[PDB]
Amino acid sequence: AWKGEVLANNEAGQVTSIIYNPGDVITIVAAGWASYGPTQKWGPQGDREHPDQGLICHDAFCGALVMKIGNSGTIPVNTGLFRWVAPNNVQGAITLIYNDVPGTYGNNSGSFSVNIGKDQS
Amino acid sequence: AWKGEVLANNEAGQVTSIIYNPGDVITIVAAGWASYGPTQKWGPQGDREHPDQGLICHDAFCGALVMKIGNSGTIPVNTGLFRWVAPNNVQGAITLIYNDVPGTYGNNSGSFSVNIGKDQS
Amino acid sequence: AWKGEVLANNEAGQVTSIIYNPGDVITIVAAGWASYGPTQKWGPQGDREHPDQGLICHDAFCGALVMKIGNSGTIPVNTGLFRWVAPNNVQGAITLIYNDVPGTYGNNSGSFSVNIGKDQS
Amino acid sequence: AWKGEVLANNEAGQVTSIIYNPGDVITIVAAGWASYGPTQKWGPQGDREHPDQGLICHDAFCGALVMKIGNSGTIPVNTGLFRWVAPNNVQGAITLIYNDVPGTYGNNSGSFSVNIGKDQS
Numbered sequence A, B, C, D: 001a002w003k004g005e006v007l008a009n010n011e012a013g014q015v016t017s018i019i020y021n022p023g024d025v026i027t028i029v030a031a032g033w034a035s036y037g038p039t040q041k042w043g044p045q046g047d048r049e050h051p052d053q054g055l056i057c058h059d060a061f062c063g064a065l066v067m068k069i070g071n072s073g074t075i076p077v078n079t080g081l082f083r084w085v086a087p088n089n090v091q092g093a094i095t096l097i098y099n100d101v102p103g104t105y106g107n108n109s110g111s112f113s114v115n116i117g118k119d120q121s
């Protein structure tokens, strides 16, 4: 399995040790408190009240945890995924990213602690 | 595995199908939005700003997800637990509970969607 | 998980650390060479040519690996069990036993090397 | 997971649906009765009394179950593999094969029933 920190200010995202292959089943658990700028913190589901002003993922709130798998678009993670299977032709290294507007990561703070494992299949 | 809803207004908590036995390894993923009363919602980590005025679990925020295993005290769950093992002499049915002050559940709303599975061991 | 040897000459069998609980999924893999008395040795399926009379397990060949769960009757194991759930109401420690006629274990020789693990469930 | 039969008389072996990828943990359980020509049958460990000459796998007995991962050399399987990680740099489809001398498969008979699954990792 993989365990590590995803910094909210890391615009390129945190590459994991997990290479998602066809057929794989994965489980993700994400925890902790982070900010996209304000003097408040939100969990891995982000800020349900903040407008989307050009987020890297339009299917999750500002300040949410998302991922890319190889060459994929952003996929919501939020608090995690339980025994999850990717779409046809989605494969490669999993990168975890804090959901924010491109070029606005410099004022972000905090992190999420994330676990990923491959399940039985 | 078990999947189900934990209602924020359910003071007795939601009993699951998971009977935790000595040696078991479990994974929990919790998601969603709930309130302990106010016209705002919080995720399974609850409200980090709200004081503890007699919460059923003093190790988690008001509005967080917690659990009991058989005859145990409350144990924080928050967003989930990854490949977790219980203390010596903690065993029995897992019950999931919204963290609030006893007798104050009537104004709560929303729910968490929760998955629990037993891992390889 | 558990790994150990089951001696063919051990009439009482080898009690393991694995406690089979309701709902558990287990995998067993057994290997090696043993005899119920002749100079030949057989694997964990035993001797398909030997008559069935007086064996501790009528549903496996003489020289096969079998088990008990708690105080159950004998259950065939043979080369192993893949992601197995008990079809009967059984609970308790797994004991591994060589299948032979009671009182005839003293001329037996060799052993099986066995792995047991609990699977995801 | 994959379940199927490996015929002893099939020199090319049975290609499975399981693609072994770097880091995968697999479990294999094999059962049944087969012959490399004689009237006797043996289990998936084969015949411990048969000489080693000309077999497709020098590290297993004649009549044993072996495999290839992609275009690898033969790898012993015997009764199975418990939570196994490839110790060598191998990737690709698992092919299951009966261990015999090339060109001598036509007098073989019987089969092994095999389960393969990917384990948690």
Ligand SMILES: Cc1ccc(C(=O)c2cc(O)c(O)c([N+](=O)[O-])c2)cc1
Pocket (backbone or CB within 6 Å): A036, A037, A051, A052, A053, A062, A100, A101, A104, A105, A107
């Ligand atoms: C149209 C517009 C106007 C103001 C901003 C803006 O200032 C801003 C700055 C951030 O650090 C930030 O994290 C976000 N966000 O999440 O939406 C917005 C961004 C876009």
Ligand SMILES: Cc1ccc(C(=O)c2cc(O)c(O)c([N+](=O)[O-])c2)cc1
Pocket (backbone or CB within 6 Å): B036, B037, B051, B052, B053, B062, B100, B101, B104, B105, B107
């Ligand atoms: C000492 C005191 C004063 C006011 C209240 C109180 O009114 C209250 C009511 C709730 O529904 C509720 O969910 C909580 N809480 O989470 O703390 C407090 C509770 C205790």
Ligand SMILES: Cc1ccc(C(=O)c2cc(O)c(O)c([N+](=O)[O-])c2)cc1
Pocket (backbone or CB within 6 Å): C036, C037, C038, C039, C050, C051, C107
């Ligand atoms: C050394 C040894 C140990 C066990 C056996 C053995 O299993 C055996 C011995 C007998 O006298 C017999 O009549 C039969 N039978 O009827 O199949 C089996 C045979 C030899």
Ligand SMILES: Cc1ccc(C(=O)c2cc(O)c(O)c([N+](=O)[O-])c2)cc1
Pocket (backbone or CB within 6 Å): C036, C037, C053, C100, C101, C104, C105, C107
């Ligand atoms: C009448 C009769 C027929 C078959 C057996 C018999 O099956 C048997 C099995 C053994 O493992 C064993 O060790 C021996 N023995 O050495 O005598 C006999 C035992 C008795």
Ligand SMILES: Cc1ccc(C(=O)c2cc(O)c(O)c([N+](=O)[O-])c2)cc1
Pocket (backbone or CB within 6 Å): D036, D037, D038, D039, D050, D051, D107
């Ligand atoms: C029907 C059949 C099929 C295969 C065998 C067999 O494997 C065999 C045949 C031989 O002529 C021989 O010399 C040896 N050897 O040296 O061990 C083995 C024996 C019989």
Ligand SMILES: Cc1ccc(C(=O)c2cc(O)c(O)c([N+](=O)[O-])c2)cc1
Pocket (backbone or CB within 6 Å): D036, D037, D053, D100, D101, D104, D105, D107
């Ligand atoms: C010189 C020599 C010695 C041993 C073998 C031999 O091992 C063998 C193996 C077979 O599976 C088989 O089917 C046969 N056959 O029937 O001839 C022979 C083959 C050739």
Ligand SMILES: [Ca+2]
Pocket (backbone or CB within 6 Å): A036, A037, A100, A101, A104, A105, A106, A107, A108
């Ligand atoms: Ca920002």
Ligand SMILES: [Ca+2]
Pocket (backbone or CB within 6 Å): B036, B037, B100, B101, B104, B105, B106, B107, B108
């Ligand atoms: Ca309340």
Ligand SMILES: [Ca+2]
Pocket (backbone or CB within 6 Å): C036, C037, C100, C104, C105, C106, C107, C108
């Ligand atoms: Ca005997």
Ligand SMILES: [Ca+2]
Pocket (backbone or CB within 6 Å): D036, D037, D100, D104, D105, D106, D107, D108
């Ligand atoms: Ca042959």
